[PDB]
PDB file of N, CA and C in Angstrom:
ATOM      1  N   UNK A   1      -3.393  12.726   8.414  1.00  0.00           N
ATOM      2  CA  UNK A   1      -4.009  11.786   7.494  1.00  0.00           C
ATOM      3  C   UNK A   1      -3.764  12.162   6.042  1.00  0.00           C
ATOM      4  N   UNK A   2      -3.827  11.170   5.156  1.00  0.00           N
ATOM      5  CA  UNK A   2      -3.626  11.353   3.724  1.00  0.00           C
ATOM      6  C   UNK A   2      -4.843  10.796   3.004  1.00  0.00           C
ATOM      7  N   UNK A   3      -5.373  11.565   2.052  1.00  0.00           N
ATOM      8  CA  UNK A   3      -6.440  11.104   1.171  1.00  0.00           C
ATOM      9  C   UNK A   3      -6.078  11.504  -0.247  1.00  0.00           C
ATOM     10  N   UNK A   4      -6.125  10.546  -1.168  1.00  0.00           N
ATOM     11  CA  UNK A   4      -5.849  10.846  -2.561  1.00  0.00           C
ATOM     12  C   UNK A   4      -4.942   9.822  -3.205  1.00  0.00           C
ATOM     13  N   UNK A   5      -4.112  10.244  -4.146  1.00  0.00           N
ATOM     14  CA  UNK A   5      -3.231   9.258  -4.737  1.00  0.00           C
ATOM     15  C   UNK A   5      -2.621   9.742  -6.041  1.00  0.00           C
ATOM     16  N   UNK A   6      -2.311   8.768  -6.895  1.00  0.00           N
ATOM     17  CA  UNK A   6      -1.374   8.948  -8.001  1.00  0.00           C
ATOM     18  C   UNK A   6      -1.961   8.290  -9.241  1.00  0.00           C
ATOM     19  N   UNK A   7      -2.107   9.056 -10.320  1.00  0.00           N
ATOM     20  CA  UNK A   7      -2.587   8.506 -11.581  1.00  0.00           C
ATOM     21  C   UNK A   7      -1.503   7.809 -12.385  1.00  0.00           C
TER      22      UNK A   7
ATOM     23  N   UNK B   1      -3.953   8.026   9.269  1.00  0.00           N
ATOM     24  CA  UNK B   1      -4.569   7.086   8.349  1.00  0.00           C
ATOM     25  C   UNK B   1      -4.323   7.462   6.897  1.00  0.00           C
ATOM     26  N   UNK B   2      -4.387   6.470   6.011  1.00  0.00           N
ATOM     27  CA  UNK B   2      -4.186   6.653   4.579  1.00  0.00           C
ATOM     28  C   UNK B   2      -5.402   6.096   3.859  1.00  0.00           C
ATOM     29  N   UNK B   3      -5.933   6.865   2.907  1.00  0.00           N
ATOM     30  CA  UNK B   3      -7.000   6.404   2.026  1.00  0.00           C
ATOM     31  C   UNK B   3      -6.638   6.804   0.608  1.00  0.00           C
ATOM     32  N   UNK B   4      -6.684   5.846  -0.313  1.00  0.00           N
ATOM     33  CA  UNK B   4      -6.409   6.146  -1.706  1.00  0.00           C
ATOM     34  C   UNK B   4      -5.502   5.122  -2.350  1.00  0.00           C
ATOM     35  N   UNK B   5      -4.671   5.544  -3.291  1.00  0.00           N
ATOM     36  CA  UNK B   5      -3.791   4.557  -3.882  1.00  0.00           C
ATOM     37  C   UNK B   5      -3.180   5.042  -5.186  1.00  0.00           C
ATOM     38  N   UNK B   6      -2.870   4.067  -6.040  1.00  0.00           N
ATOM     39  CA  UNK B   6      -1.934   4.248  -7.146  1.00  0.00           C
ATOM     40  C   UNK B   6      -2.520   3.590  -8.386  1.00  0.00           C
ATOM     41  N   UNK B   7      -2.667   4.355  -9.465  1.00  0.00           N
ATOM     42  CA  UNK B   7      -3.147   3.806 -10.726  1.00  0.00           C
ATOM     43  C   UNK B   7      -2.062   3.109 -11.530  1.00  0.00           C
TER      44      UNK B   7
ATOM     45  N   UNK C   1      -4.512   3.326  10.124  1.00  0.00           N
ATOM     46  CA  UNK C   1      -5.129   2.385   9.204  1.00  0.00           C
ATOM     47  C   UNK C   1      -4.883   2.761   7.752  1.00  0.00           C
ATOM     48  N   UNK C   2      -4.946   1.770   6.866  1.00  0.00           N
ATOM     49  CA  UNK C   2      -4.745   1.953   5.434  1.00  0.00           C
ATOM     50  C   UNK C   2      -5.962   1.396   4.714  1.00  0.00           C
ATOM     51  N   UNK C   3      -6.492   2.165   3.762  1.00  0.00           N
ATOM     52  CA  UNK C   3      -7.559   1.704   2.881  1.00  0.00           C
ATOM     53  C   UNK C   3      -7.197   2.104   1.463  1.00  0.00           C
ATOM     54  N   UNK C   4      -7.244   1.146   0.542  1.00  0.00           N
ATOM     55  CA  UNK C   4      -6.969   1.446  -0.851  1.00  0.00           C
ATOM     56  C   UNK C   4      -6.061   0.421  -1.495  1.00  0.00           C
ATOM     57  N   UNK C   5      -5.231   0.844  -2.436  1.00  0.00           N
ATOM     58  CA  UNK C   5      -4.350  -0.143  -3.027  1.00  0.00           C
ATOM     59  C   UNK C   5      -3.740   0.341  -4.331  1.00  0.00           C
ATOM     60  N   UNK C   6      -3.430  -0.633  -5.185  1.00  0.00           N
ATOM     61  CA  UNK C   6      -2.494  -0.452  -6.291  1.00  0.00           C
ATOM     62  C   UNK C   6      -3.080  -1.110  -7.530  1.00  0.00           C
ATOM     63  N   UNK C   7      -3.226  -0.345  -8.610  1.00  0.00           N
ATOM     64  CA  UNK C   7      -3.706  -0.895  -9.871  1.00  0.00           C
ATOM     65  C   UNK C   7      -2.622  -1.592 -10.675  1.00  0.00           C
TER      66      UNK C   7
ATOM     67  N   UNK D   1      -5.072  -1.374  10.979  1.00  0.00           N
ATOM     68  CA  UNK D   1      -5.688  -2.315  10.059  1.00  0.00           C
ATOM     69  C   UNK D   1      -5.442  -1.939   8.607  1.00  0.00           C
ATOM     70  N   UNK D   2      -5.506  -2.931   7.721  1.00  0.00           N
ATOM     71  CA  UNK D   2      -5.305  -2.747   6.289  1.00  0.00           C
ATOM     72  C   UNK D   2      -6.522  -3.305   5.569  1.00  0.00           C
ATOM     73  N   UNK D   3      -7.052  -2.535   4.617  1.00  0.00           N
ATOM     74  CA  UNK D   3      -8.119  -2.997   3.736  1.00  0.00           C
ATOM     75  C   UNK D   3      -7.757  -2.597   2.318  1.00  0.00           C
ATOM     76  N   UNK D   4      -7.804  -3.555   1.397  1.00  0.00           N
ATOM     77  CA  UNK D   4      -7.528  -3.254   0.004  1.00  0.00           C
ATOM     78  C   UNK D   4      -6.621  -4.279  -0.639  1.00  0.00           C
ATOM     79  N   UNK D   5      -5.791  -3.856  -1.581  1.00  0.00           N
ATOM     80  CA  UNK D   5      -4.910  -4.843  -2.171  1.00  0.00           C
ATOM     81  C   UNK D   5      -4.300  -4.359  -3.476  1.00  0.00           C
ATOM     82  N   UNK D   6      -3.989  -5.333  -4.330  1.00  0.00           N
ATOM     83  CA  UNK D   6      -3.053  -5.152  -5.436  1.00  0.00           C
ATOM     84  C   UNK D   6      -3.640  -5.811  -6.675  1.00  0.00           C
ATOM     85  N   UNK D   7      -3.786  -5.045  -7.755  1.00  0.00           N
ATOM     86  CA  UNK D   7      -4.266  -5.595  -9.016  1.00  0.00           C
ATOM     87  C   UNK D   7      -3.181  -6.292  -9.820  1.00  0.00           C
TER      88      UNK D   7
ATOM     89  N   UNK E   1      -5.632  -6.075  11.834  1.00  0.00           N
ATOM     90  CA  UNK E   1      -6.248  -7.015  10.914  1.00  0.00           C
ATOM     91  C   UNK E   1      -6.002  -6.639   9.462  1.00  0.00           C
ATOM     92  N   UNK E   2      -6.065  -7.631   8.576  1.00  0.00           N
ATOM     93  CA  UNK E   2      -5.864  -7.448   7.144  1.00  0.00           C
ATOM     94  C   UNK E   2      -7.081  -8.005   6.424  1.00  0.00           C
ATOM     95  N   UNK E   3      -7.611  -7.236   5.472  1.00  0.00           N
ATOM     96  CA  UNK E   3      -8.678  -7.697   4.591  1.00  0.00           C
ATOM     97  C   UNK E   3      -8.317  -7.297   3.173  1.00  0.00           C
ATOM     98  N   UNK E   4      -8.363  -8.255   2.252  1.00  0.00           N
ATOM     99  CA  UNK E   4      -8.088  -7.955   0.859  1.00  0.00           C
ATOM    100  C   UNK E   4      -7.181  -8.979   0.216  1.00  0.00           C
ATOM    101  N   UNK E   5      -6.350  -8.556  -0.726  1.00  0.00           N
ATOM    102  CA  UNK E   5      -5.469  -9.543  -1.316  1.00  0.00           C
ATOM    103  C   UNK E   5      -4.859  -9.059  -2.621  1.00  0.00           C
ATOM    104  N   UNK E   6      -4.549 -10.033  -3.475  1.00  0.00           N
ATOM    105  CA  UNK E   6      -3.613  -9.853  -4.581  1.00  0.00           C
ATOM    106  C   UNK E   6      -4.199 -10.511  -5.820  1.00  0.00           C
ATOM    107  N   UNK E   7      -4.345  -9.745  -6.900  1.00  0.00           N
ATOM    108  CA  UNK E   7      -4.825 -10.295  -8.161  1.00  0.00           C
ATOM    109  C   UNK E   7      -3.741 -10.992  -8.965  1.00  0.00           C
TER     110      UNK E   7
ATOM    111  N   UNK F   1       7.834 -13.066  -7.435  1.00  0.00           N
ATOM    112  CA  UNK F   1       7.981 -11.984  -6.476  1.00  0.00           C
ATOM    113  C   UNK F   1       7.485 -12.357  -5.091  1.00  0.00           C
ATOM    114  N   UNK F   2       7.228 -11.336  -4.277  1.00  0.00           N
ATOM    115  CA  UNK F   2       6.756 -11.488  -2.908  1.00  0.00           C
ATOM    116  C   UNK F   2       5.404 -10.799  -2.794  1.00  0.00           C
ATOM    117  N   UNK F   3       4.391 -11.544  -2.343  1.00  0.00           N
ATOM    118  CA  UNK F   3       3.090 -10.996  -1.962  1.00  0.00           C
ATOM    119  C   UNK F   3       2.865 -11.328  -0.494  1.00  0.00           C
ATOM    120  N   UNK F   4       2.701 -10.308   0.336  1.00  0.00           N
ATOM    121  CA  UNK F   4       2.484 -10.553   1.743  1.00  0.00           C
ATOM    122  C   UNK F   4       1.448  -9.631   2.340  1.00  0.00           C
ATOM    123  N   UNK F   5       0.501 -10.199   3.084  1.00  0.00           N
ATOM    124  CA  UNK F   5      -0.483  -9.411   3.799  1.00  0.00           C
ATOM    125  C   UNK F   5      -0.423  -9.716   5.277  1.00  0.00           C
ATOM    126  N   UNK F   6      -0.368  -8.677   6.110  1.00  0.00           N
ATOM    127  CA  UNK F   6      -0.093  -8.829   7.533  1.00  0.00           C
ATOM    128  C   UNK F   6      -1.136  -8.054   8.326  1.00  0.00           C
ATOM    129  N   UNK F   7      -1.811  -8.734   9.252  1.00  0.00           N
ATOM    130  CA  UNK F   7      -2.765  -8.083  10.135  1.00  0.00           C
ATOM    131  C   UNK F   7      -2.150  -6.996  11.001  1.00  0.00           C
TER     132      UNK F   7
ATOM    133  N   UNK G   1       8.394  -8.366  -8.290  1.00  0.00           N
ATOM    134  CA  UNK G   1       8.540  -7.284  -7.331  1.00  0.00           C
ATOM    135  C   UNK G   1       8.045  -7.656  -5.946  1.00  0.00           C
ATOM    136  N   UNK G   2       7.787  -6.636  -5.132  1.00  0.00           N
ATOM    137  CA  UNK G   2       7.316  -6.788  -3.763  1.00  0.00           C
ATOM    138  C   UNK G   2       5.964  -6.098  -3.649  1.00  0.00           C
ATOM    139  N   UNK G   3       4.951  -6.843  -3.198  1.00  0.00           N
ATOM    140  CA  UNK G   3       3.649  -6.296  -2.817  1.00  0.00           C
ATOM    141  C   UNK G   3       3.425  -6.628  -1.349  1.00  0.00           C
ATOM    142  N   UNK G   4       3.260  -5.608  -0.519  1.00  0.00           N
ATOM    143  CA  UNK G   4       3.043  -5.852   0.888  1.00  0.00           C
ATOM    144  C   UNK G   4       2.007  -4.931   1.485  1.00  0.00           C
ATOM    145  N   UNK G   5       1.060  -5.499   2.229  1.00  0.00           N
ATOM    146  CA  UNK G   5       0.077  -4.711   2.944  1.00  0.00           C
ATOM    147  C   UNK G   5       0.136  -5.016   4.422  1.00  0.00           C
ATOM    148  N   UNK G   6       0.191  -3.976   5.255  1.00  0.00           N
ATOM    149  CA  UNK G   6       0.467  -4.129   6.678  1.00  0.00           C
ATOM    150  C   UNK G   6      -0.577  -3.354   7.471  1.00  0.00           C
ATOM    151  N   UNK G   7      -1.252  -4.033   8.397  1.00  0.00           N
ATOM    152  CA  UNK G   7      -2.205  -3.383   9.279  1.00  0.00           C
ATOM    153  C   UNK G   7      -1.590  -2.295  10.146  1.00  0.00           C
TER     154      UNK G   7
ATOM    155  N   UNK H   1       8.953  -3.666  -9.145  1.00  0.00           N
ATOM    156  CA  UNK H   1       9.100  -2.583  -8.186  1.00  0.00           C
ATOM    157  C   UNK H   1       8.605  -2.956  -6.801  1.00  0.00           C
ATOM    158  N   UNK H   2       8.347  -1.936  -5.987  1.00  0.00           N
ATOM    159  CA  UNK H   2       7.875  -2.087  -4.618  1.00  0.00           C
ATOM    160  C   UNK H   2       6.523  -1.398  -4.504  1.00  0.00           C
ATOM    161  N   UNK H   3       5.510  -2.143  -4.053  1.00  0.00           N
ATOM    162  CA  UNK H   3       4.209  -1.595  -3.672  1.00  0.00           C
ATOM    163  C   UNK H   3       3.984  -1.928  -2.204  1.00  0.00           C
ATOM    164  N   UNK H   4       3.820  -0.908  -1.374  1.00  0.00           N
ATOM    165  CA  UNK H   4       3.603  -1.152   0.033  1.00  0.00           C
ATOM    166  C   UNK H   4       2.567  -0.231   0.630  1.00  0.00           C
ATOM    167  N   UNK H   5       1.620  -0.799   1.374  1.00  0.00           N
ATOM    168  CA  UNK H   5       0.636  -0.011   2.089  1.00  0.00           C
ATOM    169  C   UNK H   5       0.696  -0.316   3.567  1.00  0.00           C
ATOM    170  N   UNK H   6       0.751   0.724   4.400  1.00  0.00           N
ATOM    171  CA  UNK H   6       1.026   0.571   5.823  1.00  0.00           C
ATOM    172  C   UNK H   6      -0.017   1.346   6.616  1.00  0.00           C
ATOM    173  N   UNK H   7      -0.692   0.667   7.542  1.00  0.00           N
ATOM    174  CA  UNK H   7      -1.646   1.317   8.424  1.00  0.00           C
ATOM    175  C   UNK H   7      -1.031   2.405   9.291  1.00  0.00           C
TER     176      UNK H   7
ATOM    177  N   UNK I   1       9.513   1.035 -10.000  1.00  0.00           N
ATOM    178  CA  UNK I   1       9.659   2.117  -9.041  1.00  0.00           C
ATOM    179  C   UNK I   1       9.164   1.744  -7.656  1.00  0.00           C
ATOM    180  N   UNK I   2       8.906   2.764  -6.842  1.00  0.00           N
ATOM    181  CA  UNK I   2       8.435   2.613  -5.473  1.00  0.00           C
ATOM    182  C   UNK I   2       7.083   3.302  -5.359  1.00  0.00           C
ATOM    183  N   UNK I   3       6.070   2.557  -4.908  1.00  0.00           N
ATOM    184  CA  UNK I   3       4.768   3.105  -4.527  1.00  0.00           C
ATOM    185  C   UNK I   3       4.544   2.772  -3.059  1.00  0.00           C
ATOM    186  N   UNK I   4       4.379   3.792  -2.229  1.00  0.00           N
ATOM    187  CA  UNK I   4       4.162   3.548  -0.822  1.00  0.00           C
ATOM    188  C   UNK I   4       3.127   4.470  -0.225  1.00  0.00           C
ATOM    189  N   UNK I   5       2.179   3.901   0.519  1.00  0.00           N
ATOM    190  CA  UNK I   5       1.196   4.690   1.234  1.00  0.00           C
ATOM    191  C   UNK I   5       1.255   4.385   2.712  1.00  0.00           C
ATOM    192  N   UNK I   6       1.310   5.424   3.545  1.00  0.00           N
ATOM    193  CA  UNK I   6       1.586   5.271   4.968  1.00  0.00           C
ATOM    194  C   UNK I   6       0.543   6.046   5.761  1.00  0.00           C
ATOM    195  N   UNK I   7      -0.132   5.367   6.687  1.00  0.00           N
ATOM    196  CA  UNK I   7      -1.086   6.018   7.569  1.00  0.00           C
ATOM    197  C   UNK I   7      -0.471   7.105   8.436  1.00  0.00           C
TER     198      UNK I   7
ATOM    199  N   UNK J   1      10.072   5.735 -10.855  1.00  0.00           N
ATOM    200  CA  UNK J   1      10.219   6.817  -9.896  1.00  0.00           C
ATOM    201  C   UNK J   1       9.724   6.444  -8.511  1.00  0.00           C
ATOM    202  N   UNK J   2       9.466   7.464  -7.697  1.00  0.00           N
ATOM    203  CA  UNK J   2       8.994   7.313  -6.328  1.00  0.00           C
ATOM    204  C   UNK J   2       7.642   8.002  -6.214  1.00  0.00           C
ATOM    205  N   UNK J   3       6.630   7.257  -5.763  1.00  0.00           N
ATOM    206  CA  UNK J   3       5.328   7.805  -5.382  1.00  0.00           C
ATOM    207  C   UNK J   3       5.104   7.472  -3.914  1.00  0.00           C
ATOM    208  N   UNK J   4       4.939   8.492  -3.084  1.00  0.00           N
ATOM    209  CA  UNK J   4       4.722   8.248  -1.677  1.00  0.00           C
ATOM    210  C   UNK J   4       3.686   9.170  -1.080  1.00  0.00           C
ATOM    211  N   UNK J   5       2.739   8.601  -0.336  1.00  0.00           N
ATOM    212  CA  UNK J   5       1.756   9.390   0.379  1.00  0.00           C
ATOM    213  C   UNK J   5       1.815   9.085   1.857  1.00  0.00           C
ATOM    214  N   UNK J   6       1.870  10.124   2.690  1.00  0.00           N
ATOM    215  CA  UNK J   6       2.146   9.972   4.113  1.00  0.00           C
ATOM    216  C   UNK J   6       1.102  10.747   4.906  1.00  0.00           C
ATOM    217  N   UNK J   7       0.427  10.067   5.832  1.00  0.00           N
ATOM    218  CA  UNK J   7      -0.527  10.718   6.714  1.00  0.00           C
ATOM    219  C   UNK J   7       0.088  11.805   7.581  1.00  0.00           C
TER     220      UNK J   7
END
């Protein structure tokens, strides 16, 4: 799984 | 699964 | 599953 | 499933 | 299923 | 452009 | 561009 | 560009 | 560019 | 550029 991201 | 995204 | 998105 | 979207 | 959309 | 949402 | 969301 | 979210 | 999120 | 998040 992936949690988070890109500003 | 994926949670989050892109600003 | 996918939750989130794109600004 | 997909939840979210695009600004 | 899909929930959400496009601004 | 293309906007597409798919269940 | 292309915006696509897929369950 | 390309924005894509995939379950 | 390319923004992609994958479960 | 390329932004990618993968479960």
